[PDB]
Amino acid sequence: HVKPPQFTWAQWFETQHINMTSQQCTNAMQVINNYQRRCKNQNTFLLTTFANVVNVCGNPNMTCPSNKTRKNCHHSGSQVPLIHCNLTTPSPQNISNCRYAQTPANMFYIVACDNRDQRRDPPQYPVVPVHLDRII
């Protein structure tokens, strides 16, 4: 996974998975895609707060289903409302014209968390989410 350089991993997590800037996937995805310079095939927005995800980082460590040598993952405990956005119409030379479907659900999630970026993440949160590993 890669991010634009002005973001820490936690900031990028928040941009991709928390700050759904419209309740409509096509609009919300414009932000992510404009930053990544491509249309993502799929993306999940969790209808939860960043603070709530930080607190999930405090749940017991577990193996990450997507990256099995990693043990920095944490299960949400409870289901949360979320929205899955799926690309319906690619437009790689004009990202603004990508269109998405959306699928609401209530599901558990598994997040990878790490120590914050020393220089650029706020000291408020020593431990931050960095990857949305799995939805279940």
CATH of the domain at 113: 3.10.130.10
Choose among 80, 75, 81: nearest CA to 58: 75
Q: Which residue out of 17, 74, 75, 84 is catalytically annotated? A: 17
Cα dihedral across residues 24, 94, 15, 115: positive or negative: positive
3-state class (DSSP) for residue 59: coil
Is 33 marked as binding a ligand?
no
- Whether 113 contacts 39, CB under 8 Å: no
Q: Which tokens hold the place of 80?
A: 């949360």
The CA R_g of the chain, rounded to the nearest whole Å, is 15
Residue 131 falls in the annotated catalytic set: yes
Q: How far apart are CA 98 and CA 91, in angstroms?
A: 5
* Domain total of the chain: 1
Domain of 68 in residue numbering reads as 1-136
Q: How far apart are CA 91 and CA 47, in angstroms?
A: 27
From which experimental method does this structure derive?
Answer: X-ray
How many C-beta neighbours within 10 Å does residue 29 have?
A: 26
Is 115 marked as binding a ligand?
no
Residue 74 falls in the annotated catalytic set: no
For residue 21, give the amino acid letter.
Answer: T
Q: How far apart are CA 82 and CA 43, in angstroms?
A: 11
Q: Which tokens hold the place of 9?
A: 């991993």
Is 40 marked as binding a ligand?
yes
Q: Which tokens hold the place of 54?
A: 């930080």
Is 124 marked as binding a ligand?
no
Length of the chain, please? 136
77 Rama class: left (phi>0) / alpha (psi -120 to 50) / beta: left
